[PDB]
Amino acid sequence: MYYGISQFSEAYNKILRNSSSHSSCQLVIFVSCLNIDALCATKMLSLLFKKQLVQSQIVPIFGYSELRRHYSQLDDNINSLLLVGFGGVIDLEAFLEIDPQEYVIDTDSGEQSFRRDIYVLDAHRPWNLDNIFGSQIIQCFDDGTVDDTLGEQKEAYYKLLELDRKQRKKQIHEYEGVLEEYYSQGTTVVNSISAQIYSLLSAIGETNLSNLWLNILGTTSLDIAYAQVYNRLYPLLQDEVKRLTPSSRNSVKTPDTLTLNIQPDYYLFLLRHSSLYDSFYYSNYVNAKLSLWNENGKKRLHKMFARMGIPLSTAQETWLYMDHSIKRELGIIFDKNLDRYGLQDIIRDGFVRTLGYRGSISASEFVEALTALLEVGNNSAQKLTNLRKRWVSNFWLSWDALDDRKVELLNRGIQLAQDLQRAIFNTGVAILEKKLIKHLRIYRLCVLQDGPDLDLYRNPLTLLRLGNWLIECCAESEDKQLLPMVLASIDENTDTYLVAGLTPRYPRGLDKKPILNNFSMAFQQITAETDAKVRIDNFESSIIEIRREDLSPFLEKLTLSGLL
Amino acid sequence: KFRYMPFSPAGTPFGFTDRRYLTMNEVGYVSTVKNSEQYSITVSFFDVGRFREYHFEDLFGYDLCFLNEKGTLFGQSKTGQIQYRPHDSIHSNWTKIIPLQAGERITSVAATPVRVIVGTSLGYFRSFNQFGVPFAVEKTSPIVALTAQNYRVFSVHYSQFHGLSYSLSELGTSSKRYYKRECPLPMSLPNIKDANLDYYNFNPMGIKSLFFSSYGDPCIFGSDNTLLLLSKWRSPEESKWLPILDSNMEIWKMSGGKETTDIHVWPLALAYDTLNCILVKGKHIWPEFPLPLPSEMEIRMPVFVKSKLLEENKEIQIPVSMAAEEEYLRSKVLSELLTDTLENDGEMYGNENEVLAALNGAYDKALLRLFASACSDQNVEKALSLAHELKQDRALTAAVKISERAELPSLVKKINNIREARYE
Amino acid sequence: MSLPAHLQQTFSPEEIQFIVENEPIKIFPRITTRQKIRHTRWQLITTDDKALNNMVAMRSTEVVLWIALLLKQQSKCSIVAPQWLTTKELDRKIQYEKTHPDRFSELPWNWLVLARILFNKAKDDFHDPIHELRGKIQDLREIRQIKVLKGLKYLNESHLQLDNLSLLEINELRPFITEIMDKLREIHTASLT
């Protein structure tokens, strides 16, 4: 459909034809900040437009309210827009207040052209049909979803668009019935935005190891929450590492050799940058298998190190200084022992980059560093705006850390990630010890009223770290039914709760068709029904804000909702 | 008995690695990477203004390639699968299978703006048009190598029962001609340790590359590391092969007279006057994946007596008689190639007539530098022969000036007869 | 004043780069700009225009270094390192330096500047492995720095001779050698009647 995978070169050549001149800046990229995949996509896409000498402006955007503000004030000379990581699921023609008649030029002939193009690079679904069919200005990129999945919706969309009494009743309610089933699907991410732009670089003939690393980083960020998607794309990344890696083997290490191997990348927290003990203690997956919040879980961890034959005094050494024999024997120690605890799934092959003599970083460890930069790198309308300014300001810390010249900023990130995961854990234990997860039949509720350094959880990403930790913890327990989870946290200064709706997921080794985030409808439909004050402006529309006293009325109508 | 292997110009073996070049020439290069029982092929261009690189995954395991300015042709030697991929992708790719008998293989493939050409180890020769319509089946001596440039096709044939031979063709959109059919080819096969044998198991003929020069005169670079260019081929009764680089000698010369084993030439194209090639260094003869820049070797006629160079050097200095003998011969052959191009094809850059004028200028200056040696040794007879071959009437004034400076008044009078004879 | 104090009597290293960027360098074009007998054109005013309108892909040509770097910033060129940036020629210069304590070797005036430019911008275009070239550029840098420290024992009222010293090696020493020889001259001429 709009631009299928076969025809990304035509959309790119259309950008060059429309927006390349030495006279002016003509291209704007709007990127959702608070999304690593949109960050790695936009980094690749800027290195491309650098090499083509296309004068461009990148604007990081927090949410839909800022998208309208920034679009409203675009200089009329700007004739191409990229919307990277958002806007596929909203009607952009309605939302931005477009009327195509104010944008059309050279209408002659079975023909149109327009003074602006709006290219949507988005991996979320269900796609809004008035973008994918119902507009000539908005120009979505596709992984293949539309031709493979939307053929009944295409037909239903047009027969209903054409039809502006038995023969009518018999058909208008068939086609509205197809759209009414197409909406009333929950949200999901089905691709990485970076693997889409790498398949565009593959069409132009621009692939190299720097663009491949950004493709691996952008795609790795999915693994925590969309494991089913990482596993589709992972086979395709292995082939590209082989294709681009040079001939030499048994090579001497030199300050200039970049090597991007595929090798064991254990599912542990910041292994190469922390101790072997903290690697297990702060891992989501390990915590979920050993029940590691309570002190019998901590006994199971020591009892494992003792049985592996690693002293606690060695396991706690920083991984560089930990001894040369353990670090090469470790593959054999894990292949012997992890099976006893069911930790067998920790063995994984991943992508490991090392540059010169500065020591290896895995794609997993690098996205933990880049997210920690977005999260903590630095009158309610001012109290929101001077906070959303901070989250736009952090985007450029994560951006600059993608550069190899700036390893000191990556090393800030790798320290911040270890400060965060410790705070997530010290909060996640409080929730499980104090029994704060209430079972409400339709969903599970959790609400942080008070606690130490609670002022972290007002960033949408840090709330999702704690969400993904509580989800892994539940998803491995064999007695619990899988249920949607609502996680709420107060800001004592704004006097709102940040509320996040979370999908459950299957245990990390079991191998089904996906499950979808329908809080994105349930929150809108309850909001439209109530007189309560909320914000529904975030790009991940599973996340909302609500004033303190309105929350209990809101949850009281959420449990009644048939939409979950 | 002899074993037929698939050939592609400048392609390399896998050796111990998981990757090789299927081909290289003036357009670009192609490499294949072994990738868990399927392959990935990357096609790269030396001109990035005209062509955009691409890659695909190959399920079939192609081992033949030919790359030109219109498309890339792939073949799988053992199953007879061929595929043509045009470069604009306005035209579709196409795929076909050609009928191989038991133990038959495709030995090489080529493409022309209007034809795709396939040759096999039993010497069938199958033409398809540019869209995959069969146009012919000939039978020939088995074709061990093919090349094309525009409408010209050049093939090398070999069999135990026929010896080495070549054919040269110009198939055209109209007025098809075969210039030579199966004429004998004056090129050395190898003297049949693993540094050589891992290459000769892959390419038994030792043809490192087969190409046309940029002006469309055939070239071949054999196991003997000598570049042979076919002269005057547009008129078959006057054709000859010229050895225009002895590249072993030209390496020994630049490494200062060390017998040098760690360096090998790998040829890509002869632009006029200069072989584009990789100089490979190390114990394998062929280059590796980060393809080094094509170096340039200027062509040199093989008139360098190594023993004389040894005694006068004991950076290499070349005796000024030997240097003048080479520049006179090199200029005489290049001026004949340009002259025949300009007369039969016409110029493609306006410069070519100004190159030819400058090239005659280097010929007469080389002959006068030989005439000085003939005067120094007072061989008036040798001097008069050198003066008679001299072209410009204005350069023959220098011959009489040199003969007066040498005080050889016989040469003065004889040269004055040449002035009047050539004026008439 | 009109000119900043740190420029008043010397060049900044960025002005020493700008001077070196005005030299010819050999390249392999990856674009054919040459029109056939069977379009935009360069029209420059400080350098020879006739070399750029006649490029043919992979036949070498010379262009001014600031154009080679501007083409190499796209994929549209590759820069052929001079013959003296080879591990053979650098190792002959290192041997010369060790063998002749009394003299600097005949390296070109721009050798440190051009090594630093090409190792950053053209890192893939060397025939030798770039870590051995960086290693020998440092070996040469260090030997010449010893010979400079020996030379400064002779600062004088009359002159010095510094035959093969690079422009970048002169430019670091300029505000020391000339400032001290200026005070030795003032102390000397003051003594005269």
Side-chain angles (χ1 to χ4, degrees), chain A residues 11 21 24 54 57 76 87 128 161 208 214 259 269 271 297 309 321 332 372 376 426 451-452 472 498 552-553:
Chain A
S21 73
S24 296
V54 178
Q57 185 188 11
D76 275 292
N128 184 59
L161 186 67
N208 62 19
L214 296 169
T259 72
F269 186 69
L271 178 64
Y321 296 96
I332 300 95
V376 295
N426 299 153
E472 277 278 351
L498 183 67
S552 313

Short mmCIF file of all heavy atoms in Angstrom, two decimals, chain A residues 11 21 24 54 57 76 87 128 161 208 214 259 269 271 297 309 321 332 372 376 426 451-452 472 498 552-553:
data_model
loop_
_atom_site.label_atom_id
_atom_site.label_comp_id
_atom_site.label_asym_id
_atom_site.label_seq_id
_atom_site.Cartn_x
_atom_site.Cartn_y
_atom_site.Cartn_z
N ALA A 11 10.19 6.79 -2.53
CA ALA A 11 9.95 7.77 -1.48
C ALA A 11 11.21 8.56 -1.13
O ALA A 11 11.17 9.76 -0.89
CB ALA A 11 9.40 7.05 -0.27
N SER A 21 18.23 21.34 -2.02
CA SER A 21 18.89 22.50 -2.61
C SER A 21 19.96 23.04 -1.67
O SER A 21 19.87 22.94 -0.45
CB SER A 21 17.90 23.60 -3.00
OG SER A 21 17.39 24.27 -1.87
N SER A 24 18.70 26.58 0.85
CA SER A 24 17.87 26.65 2.05
C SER A 24 17.80 25.30 2.76
O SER A 24 18.02 24.26 2.15
CB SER A 24 16.44 27.04 1.67
OG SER A 24 16.36 28.34 1.11
N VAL A 54 21.91 17.22 2.10
CA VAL A 54 20.55 17.74 2.24
C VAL A 54 20.44 18.57 3.52
O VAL A 54 20.54 18.04 4.62
CB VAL A 54 19.52 16.60 2.20
CG1 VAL A 54 18.09 17.11 2.40
CG2 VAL A 54 19.57 15.88 0.85
N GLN A 57 16.61 20.00 9.44
CA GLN A 57 16.42 20.29 10.86
C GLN A 57 15.75 19.12 11.57
O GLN A 57 14.68 18.70 11.14
CB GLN A 57 15.58 21.55 11.04
CG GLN A 57 15.45 21.95 12.51
CD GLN A 57 14.48 23.08 12.79
OE1 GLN A 57 13.70 23.50 11.95
NE2 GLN A 57 14.47 23.62 13.98
N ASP A 76 6.77 28.05 5.92
CA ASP A 76 6.08 27.54 4.71
C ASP A 76 6.99 27.07 3.57
O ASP A 76 6.53 26.44 2.63
CB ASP A 76 5.08 28.58 4.20
CG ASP A 76 3.75 28.46 4.92
OD1 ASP A 76 3.05 27.45 4.72
OD2 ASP A 76 3.38 29.38 5.67
N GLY A 87 2.44 8.77 15.04
CA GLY A 87 1.43 9.34 14.17
C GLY A 87 0.74 8.37 13.22
O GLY A 87 -0.23 8.76 12.60
N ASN A 128 -4.18 3.84 11.27
CA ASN A 128 -5.38 4.57 10.99
C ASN A 128 -5.66 4.59 9.49
O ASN A 128 -4.83 5.00 8.69
CB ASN A 128 -5.26 5.94 11.63
CG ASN A 128 -6.54 6.64 11.41
OD1 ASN A 128 -7.60 6.19 11.82
ND2 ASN A 128 -6.51 7.69 10.65
N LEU A 161 -16.63 4.78 1.56
CA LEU A 161 -16.24 6.10 1.07
C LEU A 161 -17.01 6.51 -0.21
O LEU A 161 -17.33 7.67 -0.40
CB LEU A 161 -14.73 6.08 0.82
CG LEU A 161 -14.10 7.43 0.44
CD1 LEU A 161 -14.17 8.41 1.59
CD2 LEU A 161 -12.64 7.24 0.08
N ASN A 208 26.81 0.04 5.57
CA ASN A 208 28.15 -0.12 6.13
C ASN A 208 28.03 -0.51 7.61
O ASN A 208 26.93 -0.61 8.13
CB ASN A 208 28.96 1.16 5.90
CG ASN A 208 28.39 2.38 6.56
OD1 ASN A 208 27.59 2.30 7.48
ND2 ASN A 208 28.78 3.54 6.15
N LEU A 214 23.69 0.86 14.28
CA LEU A 214 22.46 1.57 14.61
C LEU A 214 21.21 0.74 14.34
O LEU A 214 20.25 0.83 15.09
CB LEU A 214 22.44 2.87 13.82
CG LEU A 214 23.56 3.83 14.20
CD1 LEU A 214 23.63 4.95 13.18
CD2 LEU A 214 23.33 4.43 15.57
N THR A 259 35.62 -4.63 15.48
CA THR A 259 35.04 -5.95 15.20
C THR A 259 33.65 -6.04 15.77
O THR A 259 33.46 -5.72 16.93
CB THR A 259 35.89 -7.10 15.73
OG1 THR A 259 35.84 -7.21 17.12
CG2 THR A 259 37.36 -7.01 15.39
N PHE A 269 22.41 -8.23 33.47
CA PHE A 269 22.42 -6.78 33.49
C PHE A 269 23.82 -6.15 33.51
O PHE A 269 24.50 -6.15 34.53
CB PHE A 269 21.57 -6.29 34.65
CG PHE A 269 21.41 -4.80 34.63
CD1 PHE A 269 20.66 -4.20 33.62
CD2 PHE A 269 22.05 -4.00 35.58
CE1 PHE A 269 20.57 -2.81 33.54
CE2 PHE A 269 21.94 -2.61 35.52
CZ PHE A 269 21.22 -2.02 34.49
N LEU A 271 26.83 -6.85 32.25
CA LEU A 271 27.90 -7.77 32.60
C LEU A 271 29.30 -7.18 32.46
O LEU A 271 30.05 -7.16 33.43
CB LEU A 271 27.74 -9.04 31.77
CG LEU A 271 28.81 -10.11 31.98
CD1 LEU A 271 28.82 -10.65 33.40
CD2 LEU A 271 28.57 -11.26 31.02
N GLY A 297 15.26 -15.88 48.10
CA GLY A 297 15.75 -15.71 46.75
C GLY A 297 17.22 -15.32 46.70
O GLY A 297 17.99 -15.87 45.92
N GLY A 309 31.04 -22.72 41.72
CA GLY A 309 32.43 -22.73 42.13
C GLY A 309 33.12 -21.40 41.93
O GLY A 309 34.31 -21.37 41.63
N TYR A 321 38.66 -6.49 36.06
CA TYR A 321 39.63 -6.96 37.03
C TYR A 321 39.37 -8.39 37.50
O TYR A 321 40.24 -8.99 38.12
CB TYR A 321 39.63 -5.98 38.19
CG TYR A 321 40.11 -4.62 37.76
CD1 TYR A 321 39.22 -3.59 37.41
CD2 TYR A 321 41.48 -4.41 37.63
CE1 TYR A 321 39.70 -2.35 36.96
CE2 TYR A 321 41.97 -3.18 37.18
CZ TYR A 321 41.08 -2.15 36.85
OH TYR A 321 41.59 -0.95 36.49
N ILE A 332 31.52 -22.57 29.90
CA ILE A 332 31.44 -23.95 30.38
C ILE A 332 30.76 -24.01 31.74
O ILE A 332 29.93 -24.88 31.95
CB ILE A 332 32.85 -24.59 30.42
CG1 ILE A 332 33.53 -24.62 29.04
CG2 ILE A 332 32.77 -26.03 30.95
CD1 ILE A 332 34.46 -23.46 28.76
N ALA A 372 19.24 4.95 29.89
CA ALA A 372 19.55 5.65 31.11
C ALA A 372 19.90 7.12 30.88
O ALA A 372 19.60 7.94 31.73
CB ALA A 372 20.68 4.93 31.81
N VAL A 376 17.45 10.07 32.92
CA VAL A 376 18.05 10.91 33.98
C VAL A 376 19.33 11.61 33.54
O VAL A 376 20.24 11.81 34.34
CB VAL A 376 18.25 10.13 35.31
CG1 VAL A 376 16.93 9.71 35.93
CG2 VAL A 376 19.13 8.89 35.17
N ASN A 426 14.88 -1.62 44.34
CA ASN A 426 14.49 -1.19 45.69
C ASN A 426 13.04 -0.70 45.79
O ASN A 426 12.51 -0.61 46.89
CB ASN A 426 15.43 -0.10 46.19
CG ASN A 426 16.89 -0.47 46.31
OD1 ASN A 426 17.75 0.37 46.21
ND2 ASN A 426 17.22 -1.70 46.55
N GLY A 451 7.18 6.91 48.82
CA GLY A 451 8.40 6.11 48.80
C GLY A 451 9.69 6.88 48.53
O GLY A 451 9.66 8.07 48.23
N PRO A 452 10.86 6.22 48.65
CA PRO A 452 12.17 6.83 48.44
C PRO A 452 12.44 7.07 46.96
O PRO A 452 12.24 6.19 46.13
CB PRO A 452 13.17 5.84 49.05
CG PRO A 452 12.48 4.49 48.88
CD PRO A 452 11.01 4.84 49.07
N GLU A 472 7.84 -9.27 34.16
CA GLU A 472 8.70 -10.46 34.09
C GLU A 472 8.50 -11.32 35.34
O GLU A 472 8.29 -12.52 35.25
CB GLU A 472 10.18 -10.06 33.97
CG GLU A 472 10.59 -9.74 32.53
CD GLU A 472 10.91 -10.96 31.66
OE1 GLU A 472 11.00 -12.10 32.15
OE2 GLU A 472 11.12 -10.79 30.44
N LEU A 498 0.81 9.70 37.15
CA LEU A 498 1.16 9.09 35.88
C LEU A 498 0.69 7.63 35.90
O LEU A 498 1.15 6.85 36.73
CB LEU A 498 2.67 9.22 35.67
CG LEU A 498 3.13 8.67 34.32
CD1 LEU A 498 2.62 9.49 33.15
CD2 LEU A 498 4.63 8.71 34.25
N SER A 552 -9.57 7.47 41.58
CA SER A 552 -10.44 6.40 42.08
C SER A 552 -11.77 6.31 41.29
O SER A 552 -12.11 5.21 40.87
CB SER A 552 -10.63 6.52 43.58
OG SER A 552 -9.39 6.71 44.22
N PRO A 553 -12.48 7.41 40.97
CA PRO A 553 -13.56 7.40 39.99
C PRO A 553 -13.19 6.82 38.62
O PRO A 553 -14.01 6.16 37.99
CB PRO A 553 -13.97 8.86 39.84
CG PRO A 553 -13.61 9.48 41.17
CD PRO A 553 -12.39 8.71 41.61
#
